[PDB]
Amino acid sequence: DGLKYSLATGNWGDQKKAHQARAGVSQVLNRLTFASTLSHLRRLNSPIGRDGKLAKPRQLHNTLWGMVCPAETPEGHAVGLVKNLALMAYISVGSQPS
Amino acid sequence: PYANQPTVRITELTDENVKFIIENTDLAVANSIRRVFIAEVPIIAIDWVQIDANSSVLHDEFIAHRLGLIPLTSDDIVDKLQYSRDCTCEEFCPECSVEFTLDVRCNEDQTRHVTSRDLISNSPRVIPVTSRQDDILIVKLRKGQELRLRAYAKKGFGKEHAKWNPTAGVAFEYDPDNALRHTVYPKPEEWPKSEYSELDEDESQAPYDPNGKPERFYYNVESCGSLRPETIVLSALSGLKKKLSDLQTQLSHEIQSD
Amino acid sequence: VYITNFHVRMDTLAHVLYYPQKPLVTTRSMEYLRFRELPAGINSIVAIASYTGYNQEDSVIMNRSAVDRGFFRSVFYRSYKEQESKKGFDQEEVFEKPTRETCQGMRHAIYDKLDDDGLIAPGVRVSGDDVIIGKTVTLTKRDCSTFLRTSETGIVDQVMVTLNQEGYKFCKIRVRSVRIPQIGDKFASRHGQKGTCGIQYRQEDMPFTCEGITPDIIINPHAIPSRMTIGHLIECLQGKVSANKGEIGDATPFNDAVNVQKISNLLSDYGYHLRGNEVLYNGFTGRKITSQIFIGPTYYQRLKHMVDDKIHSRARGPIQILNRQPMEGRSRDGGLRFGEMERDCQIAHGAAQFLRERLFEASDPYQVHVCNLCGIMA
Amino acid sequence: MIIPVRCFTCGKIVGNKWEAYLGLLQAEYTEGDALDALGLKRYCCRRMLLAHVDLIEKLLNYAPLE
Amino acid sequence: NELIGQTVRISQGPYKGYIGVVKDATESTARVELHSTCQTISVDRQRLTTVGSRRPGGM
Amino acid sequence: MGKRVDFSARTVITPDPNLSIDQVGVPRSIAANMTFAEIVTPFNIDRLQEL
Amino acid sequence: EKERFRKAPPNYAMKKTQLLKEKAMAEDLGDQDKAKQIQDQLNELEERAEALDRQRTKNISAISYINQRNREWNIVESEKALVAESHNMKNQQMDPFTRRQCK
Amino acid sequence: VIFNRQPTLHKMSMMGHRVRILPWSTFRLNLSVTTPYNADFDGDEMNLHLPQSLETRAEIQELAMVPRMIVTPQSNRPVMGIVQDTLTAVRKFTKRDVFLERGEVMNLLMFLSTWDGKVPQPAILKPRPLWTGKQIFSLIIPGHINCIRTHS
Amino acid sequence: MNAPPAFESFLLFEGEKKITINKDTKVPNACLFTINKEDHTLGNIIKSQLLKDPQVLFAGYKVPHPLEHKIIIRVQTTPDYSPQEAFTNAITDLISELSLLEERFRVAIKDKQEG
Amino acid sequence: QQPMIYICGECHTENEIKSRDPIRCRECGYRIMYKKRTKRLVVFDAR
Amino acid sequence: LEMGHDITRLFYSNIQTVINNWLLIEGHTIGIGDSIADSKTYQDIQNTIKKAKQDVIEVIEKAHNNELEPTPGNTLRQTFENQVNRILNDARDKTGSSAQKSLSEYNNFKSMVVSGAKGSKINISQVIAVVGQQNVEGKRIPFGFKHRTLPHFIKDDYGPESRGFVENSYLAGLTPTEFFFHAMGGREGLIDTAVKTAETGY
Amino acid sequence: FIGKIPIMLRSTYCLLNGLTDRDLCELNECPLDPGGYFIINGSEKVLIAQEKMATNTVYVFAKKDSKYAYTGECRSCLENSSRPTSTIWVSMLAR
RNA sequence: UAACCGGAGAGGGAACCCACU
Ligand SMILES: [Mg+2]
Ligand SMILES: [Zn+2]
Ligand SMILES: [Zn+2]
Ligand SMILES: [Zn+2]
Ligand SMILES: [Zn+2]
Structure with a gap:
């Protein structure tokens, strides 16, 4: 039930302390058009909260070349925080340093 | 002047x-x-479709729309018919419409092409253009799917529908x-x-x-x-x-x- | 077509076009997106001309005859889920046709439209406030059925009955609704040119070239100069060359082998103005319009923001329980908020009577008694 | 899903030309010569067969029975 | 009332040859929800013919 | 200071150059939904009788 | 009792039967059961493939042929266009295209 | 009816309009009213409020009606003007070398409301009757106005 | 849901008059013919035929709103010629033109076939 | 005397399900099943 | 001010209706033919941009040689940045101006700019001649990597295209590096819009 | 038995793995589905990638809005231990 | 030297995410 709950509501934590957890980590897949499903499956998310008057975390840094799409961002209040992988960007899965 | x-x-x-x-x-x-x-x-065109049974992958309204756009050979019958809305009869009659029938079921293993060859007509002079060159594909059916419908073509002109x-x-x-x-x-x-x-x-x-x-x-x-x-x-x-x-x-x- | 098995999916809010088309000018990297196998849009003959003033201020004119031929016609699927349950010792929820001879709480709906099982049948023309799932809860019994959302108006597509984890009867019903593109529907291009369909003309009324080629969509020229979507013009120019060559052009971003002049050189080999313009004839009078119109195939999309899913009106509808004001939202038959900024807008107007009406008389009028000397709220 | 019966812009019947177009492309035809042979002159009608994607072939893979 | 909720066929006027179910009927007119279009029209009650939908044999 | 009000409608706006600058083209269902309370008078008793 | 005399592979239980047979073969540590399951799965796969090819024998085989031919023709068209590009290397003078030349 | 776009930033965001019922399902409004509401037609939505009394309808008609809101106290200038497409069209229309024959003038005059019913003397009588663009546009300017402006 | 039925562009309702004449008061010998359920197809030919009449001072037409099916033709003739007969003659001779065109097309066809 | 016939899923065999019955196919076992098309009059004025 | 508000009401409607009905005869459009610049103006554009690039190179040489004199108020590095920005602003403005005078009387960008209906001469400059310098926070593109703006450039490269100066036009297309720099420049507009909306309403 | 774990579609532990194109259609599914999402109560859920600061790395920032001239942050994290990441701070006072 | 019926609105909530101008 703990898995099934955190994956259903999106709150990353326990149900007794849900208001203290993260939110929106697990979202309903967007089956509206294939290009929306694919883009929802390769979506990044900077956890910086909204109501933020700062601009540096929202700006397209030079170092996002080839990793993050420099054009696909929401135009609302999440502009620059929600991102998208470039086509040939691969995220390392990890290995033992031994 | x-x-x-x-x-x-x-x-x-x-x-x-x-x-x-x-x-x-x-x-x-x-x-x-x-x-x-x-x-x-x-011109005579299908404008009324009663689907007896449809099991195709095409939707019931999709079939009706496609049947609407099949051109019918109106050369001398079109100048005899009465506009449907101006006819005296209840429902339809030969004076104001051309009856059409399409009862098709796929039983063979290969897929069935439901072309306009399958549109039966109650009259010999008004039919889909097949006299004398493939035929307009209406549906594609797999094994066990069917399409059965009655239709009437009314006298109309392009100002109402294309x-x-x-x-x-x-x-x-x-x-x-x-x-x-x-x-x-x-x-x-x-x-x-x-x-x-x-x-x-x-x-x-x-x-x-x-x-x-x-x-x-x-x-x-x-x-x-x-x-x-x-x-x-x-x-x-x-x-x-x-x-x-x-x-x-x-x-x-x-x-x-x- | 958002997925090839969309007929098995009992999704909430699915949209699929009647005749989606592959883009005539594509990038080489949309092959790996699988976009030519599940495309979203139709190549349309766009004429970037200010015609009769409705193709105006981000709006677009559309060819009504093209729509009649299935242009951008789409079907809208909505799914309703319901589950029976053991409410308690005394009360049980079950699917049965609500019946005034034994059920209380019945309403003005036509309950004859759904079968004895308690579920509307596939292929039944439903409408707003028609009963979709005949649930009854025994207390003799209270009609707790589920009704089609007000002003949805579709035809039941398929009805599935099964069991859930708890082994209770559980049905997901979905209703299809064909959506011809009317005026007010939102259409966009692949370059950021969002626009609503301003008005629709028949083929006899649209402008036509030296042959009977009329636009499917006419878009305002004033959309280009400030937004500088020159890629829209280059696409509208290369789609012509792709439709004449008879094979699909390339629009990879940084090609260095596809510049405007080479496309124009190709386009002039098929008997057209090398820059894409054409001599249109006014559809109303047949006289040539003195400016040669830019025209060509352009891959236009149909966005999900259809007007009939946004038109909303109210006149003394339901009311909230705590503060007896109109409900909120279109689905609840709520009323629009007369926010504070509107209050200030009316204050600046000096229209104190309209302000009073809006904030007291059309929202929540009430009366209380009070003492003339000491008592308060008698 | 399926080839439109008529060209959206023109009105010319293109519903009987998808299979013939596929046959001509089964031959070694260049993609434009097939349209030219099918009597499609206007580019509005040519785009109907150029851009069409036949999904009804994919939907028929979900056999109801057998 | 009497024919509310029944399936009717509009047998005269501009909406000839249309099938729909009567949403509300009065002594003069009736509101038929057309089966094909997504609309409910108000037709006169003498323009209508009841078609019904029943199955015989029941055994 | 801010409430929800009866007799209000919301819809997508679209251009219409044929309307006078002081005219708004409402659709037919919105006009057929909301009402205006009008007093009866020997002046307009027949118009409202027919209505 | 119905499944007793009615064959399992009729008609839509094929893929589910394939998965169940693979699970049964995997769950058994005995070689005889594994070999019997392998033979049964091979026979069922052959029969199902024949049935699927018979159904797709018409109207879908044709478009698969023309799709393989389309992509093959495209890989041929690309290389012939590339040889044309290599051949047309006499003079490239058109103006409207540029590239960076810093430093 | 009094008509609003929810970002009601200034007084001209809630101007009052006369209603005309039209077939399709959208709030159609004149182009020139775009600038007051800052409301393009890419999908924008606006709220319609219907007053519910004679004392309120009269107040709206006499205080908030659209033509009474042409000039704004914010900067003493108009806020509604000939804007967007019709401005380019009118610039091209008033060029010195725009000439029209009787058949086009008599069709354009059909779209003037305050036309006095008299066709003006064509600017060129021979070798053929031709009307200059300014000659037709002078019929649209009301009354006897006197102003001097400079083209861009 | 608010889409008008397509038959409303040519089918007259009950009570509507096909054509309605109103005398214009702002100038003498001027009328306004209001054709219901018509469009540029029938207004344009009438107008263009009226401009060939030497006794017609003014002729013009409009479609007041593209969503409404009605045209307003305005005629103004000389004092010795009422616009009623101007309009009537401009329809009569227009019908004659179209009938002549029908006849000449019909003969040219049979001359083209095996000829 | 109509028993409310359903169509199975994986089976596609018509089953007779009355009230107070478990939704399962008469053969092979299936908890998913759909409903048959209506017998009402389906008429489309094709447009 | 002279006539009432009703006569002006009819004035507005009459202008719209009469002019839009004439627009059915005149017609109006925009297309690729309005962006092409006759191949004579393209030579001027290229020459101006190349001379600007050479001037920037000379300024860089003077700075590296410590020959660049600090202008009043500004420091050495700040005066170098001001010099480069001044030179490239001159380049963009001059190329745009040369583009303006090359447009034919029938050019549909000019018809929409001189009417004032939509667009500005800067949009014509960017579409036809050159897009220009892309700034973020008022400065040229910053060294996001270690002493360079992208992996494709060399450390300590202050040249035009190394720091964001877009030298192509929207008709000729953007080189990938300057495409990314243009995206960086354009993100500022979206961020500022999204924060302005919430900051001014309060 | 410990409990149920939700499986992401088209993973190495889904029934829809390494499966051919005939079989995906036989199971009434599409061969174009990318996978990568969970089914939770019949709803397709996607885990959106969350970015953070890289652990076990030194960062010297300069917070001007405090008493410190510099701050050598280091978010240390051994490896997915039951102890969440802990951070050192070797800062320098302003004076 | 006679003539059968009368009942009316079922009335619901927080949070988070996504999207639109
Ligand atoms: Mg907008
Ligand atoms: Zn008849
Ligand atoms: Zn008291
Ligand atoms: Zn065509
Ligand atoms: Zn079973």
């Missing part, structure tokens, strides 16, 4: 399109004839060379010659003609298979003539009553 004297000269006549030139007529008349070619030419449009494309054109300067080219030499340009390859556009009206309106009426391409023109002229006659009768009634 009185009537100008229009002429006609058919340059190409096939069973699929007609190219003719109208001379000595006003632009408004020659363009209204074009508009009547598209909208106000009656299914009653008897033309593929009407190519209306006048004054090929820019003699009247009705259009201004920023660079006249970048523009290809019209098909009817009585102009050598040296000059770009005809020298300006200050006093001159548009005549010699070049048409290319292409049928969709329903009406023969000359019957389209004949019936369009008849229909515009009849619109004007009816309006004149109503105007006389308005005048005598004032």
Whole structure:
């Protein structure tokens, strides 16, 4: 039930302390058009909260070349925080340093 | 004040399109004839579908829409029928509609192409264009899927729905060379010659003609298979003539009553 | 077509086009997106011309005859889920046709439209406030059925009955609704040119070339100069060359082998103005319009923001329980908020009577008694 | 899903030309010569067969029975 | 009332040859929700013919 | 200071150059939904009788 | 009792039967059961493939042929266009295209 | 009816309009009213409020009606003007070399409301009657106005 | 849901008059003919025929709203010619033109076929 | 005397399900099943 | 001010209706033919941009040689940045101006700019001649990586295209590096819009 | 038995793995589905990638809005231990 | 020297995410 709950509501934590957890980590897949499903499956998310008057975390840094799409961002209040992988960007899965 | 004297000269006549030139007529008349070619030419087309059973991957409304767009050979029956909304009968009758039937089931292993060969008709002269070249595909069925429906085709014209449009494309054109300067080219030499340009390859556009009206309106009426391409023109002229006659009768009634 | 098995999916809010088309000018990297196998849009003959003033201020004119031929026609699927349950010792929820002879709480709906099982049948023309799932809860019994959302108006597509984890009867019903593109529907291009369908003309009324080629969509020229979507013009120019060549052009971003002049050189080999313009004839009078119109195939999309899913009106509808004001939202038959900024807008107007009406008389009028000397709220 | 019966812009019947177009492309035809042979002159009608994607072939893979 | 909720066929006027179910009927007119279009029209009650939908045999 | 009000409608706006600058083209269902309370008078008793 | 005399592979239980047979073969540590399951799965796969090819024998085989031919023709068209590019290397003078030349 | 776009930033965001019922399902409004509401037609939505009394309808008609809101106290200038497409069209229309024949003038005059019913003397009588663009546009300017402006 | 039925562009309702004449008061010998359920197809030809009449001072037409099916033709003739008969003659001779065109097309067709 | 016939899923065999019955196919076992098309009059004015 | 508000009401409607009905005869459009610049103006554009690039190179040489004199108020590095920005602003403005005078009377960008309906001469400059310098926070593109703006450039490269100066036009297309720099420049507009909306309403 | 774990579609532990194109259609599914999402109560859920600061790395920032001239942050994290990441701070005072 | 029926609105909530101008 703990898995099934955190994956259903999106709150990353326990149900007794849900208001203290993260939110929106697990979202309903967007089956509206294939290009929306694919883009929802390769979506990044900077956890910086909204109501933020700062601009540096929202700006397209030079170092996002080839990793993050420099054009696909929401135009609302999440502009620059929600991102998208470039086509040939691969995220390392990890290995033992031994 | 009185009537100008229009002429006609058919340059190409096939069973699929007609190219003719109208001379000595006003632009408004020659363009209204074009508009009547598209909208106000009656034609028989499926406009009512009762689906007995449908198991195809196409939706019930998809089948109805596709059946609506199949052209039916209306050449002499169309001038006999009564408009559906103006007929006295309850439901449908031969005077105001052509019955159609399509009962199909796929049992063979290979997929069934539900073309227009499967549209049965209660009359021999009004059918999908199959007389004399593949046929319009309505549905594709797998093993165990079916389509069974009754349909009626009503007398209509392209002003209500595009299914009653008897033309593929009407190519209306006048004054090929820019003699009247009705259009201004920023660079006249970048523009290809019209098909009817009585102009050598040296000059770009005809020298300006200050006093001159548009005549010699070049048409290319292409049928969709329903009406023969000359019957389209004949019936369009008849229909515009009849619109004007009816309006004149109503105007006389308005005048005598004032 | 958002997925090839969309007929098995009992999704909430699915949209699929009747005749989606592959883009005539594509990038080489949309092959790996699988976009030519599940495309979203139709190549349309766009004419970038200010015609008759409705193709105006981000709006677009559309060819009504093209729509009649299935242009951008789409079907809208909505799914309703319901589950029976054991409410308690005394009360049980079950699917049965609500019946005034034994059920209380019945309403003005036509309950004859759904079968004895308690579920509407596949292929039944439903409408707003029609009963979709005949649930009854025994207390004799209270009609707790589920009704089609007000002003949805579709035809039941398929009805599935099964069990859930708890072994209770559980049905997901979905209703299809064909959506012809009317005026007010939102259409966009592949370059950021969003626009609503301003008005629809028949083929006889649209402008036409030297042959009977009329636009499917007419878009305002004033959309280009400030937004500088020159890629829209280059696409509208190369789609013509792709439709004449008879094979699909390339629009990879940084090609260096596809510049405007080479496309124009190709386009002039098929008997067209090398820059894409054409001599249109006014659809109303048949006279040539003195400016040669830019025209060509352009891959236009149909966005999900259809007007009939946004038109909303109210006149003394339901009311909230705590503060007896109109409900909120279109689905609840709520009323629009007369926010504070509107209050200030009316204050600046000096229209104190309209302000009073809006904030007191059309929202929540009430009366109380009060003492003339000491008592408060008697 | 399936080839449109008529060209959206013109009105010319293109519903009986998808299979013939596929056959001509089964031959070594260049993609434009097939349209030219099918009597499609206007580019509005040519785009109907150029851009069409036949999904009804993919939907028929979900056999109801057998 | 009497024919509310029944399937009718509009047998006259512009909406000839249309099937729908009567949403509300009065002594003069009736509101038929058309089966094909997504609309409810108000037709006169003499323009209508009841078609019904029943199955015989029941055994 | 801010409430929800009866007799209000919301819809997508679209251009119409044929309307006068002081005219708004409402659709037919919105006009057929909301009402205006009108007093009866010997002046307009027949119009409202027919309505 | 119905499944007793009615064959399992009729008609839509094929893929589910394939998965169940693979699970049964995997769950058994005995070689005889594994071999019997392998033979049964091979026979069922052959029968199902024959049935699927028979159904797709018409109207879907054709478009698969023309799709393989389309992509093959495209890989041929690309290389012939590339040889044309290599051949047309006489003079490239058109203006409207540029590239960076810093430093 | 009084008509609003929810970002009601200034007084001209809630101007009052006369209603006309039209077939399709959208709030159609004149182009020139775009600038007051800052409301393009890419999908924008606006709220319609219907007053519910004579004392309120009269107040709206006499205080908030659209033509009474042409000039704004914010900057003493108009806020509604000939804008967007019709401005380019009118610039091209008023060029010195725009000439029209009787058949086009008599069609354009059909769209003037305050036309006095008299066709003005064409600017060119021979070799052929031709009307200059300014000649037709002078019929649209009301009354006897006197102003001097400079083209861009 | 608010889409008008397509038959409303040519089918008259009950009570509507096909054509309605109103005398214009702002100038003498001027009328306004209001045709219901018509469009540029029938207004344009009438107008263009009226401009060939030498006794017609003014002729013009409009479609007041593209969503409404009605045209307003305005005629103004000389004092010795009422616009009623101007309009009537401009429809009569227009019908004659179209009938002549029908006849000449019909003969040219049979001359083209095996000829 | 109509028993409310359903169509199975994986089976596609018509089953007779009355009230107070478990939704399972008469053969092979299936908890998913759909409903048959209506017998009401389906008429589309094709447009 | 002279007539009432009703006569002006009819004035507005009459202008719209009469002019839009004439627009059915005149017609109006925009297309690729309005962006092409006749191949004579392209030579001027290229020459101006190349001379600007050479001037920037000379300024860089002077700075590296410590020959660049600090202008009043500004420091050495700040005056170098001001010099480069001044030179590239001159380049963009001059190329745009040359583009303006090359447009034919029938050019549909000019018809929409001189009417004032939509667009500005800067949009014509960017579409036809050159897009220009892309700034973020008022400065040229910053060294996001270690002493360079992208991996494709070399450390300590202050040249035009190394720091964001877009030298192509929207008709000729953007080189990938300057495409990314243009995206960086354009993100500022979206961020500022999203924060302005919430900051001014309060 | 410990409990149920939700499986992401088209993973190495989904029934829809390494499966051919005939079989995906036989199971009424599409061969174009990318996978990568969970089914939770019949709803397709996607885990959106969350970015953070890289652990076990030194960062020297300069917070001007405090008493410190510099701050050598280091978010240390051994490896997915039951102890969440802990951070050192070797800062320098302003004076 | 006679004539059968009368009942009316079922009335619901927080949070988070996504999206639109
Ligand atoms: Mg907008
Ligand atoms: Zn009949
Ligand atoms: Zn008291
Ligand atoms: Zn076509
Ligand atoms: Zn079972």
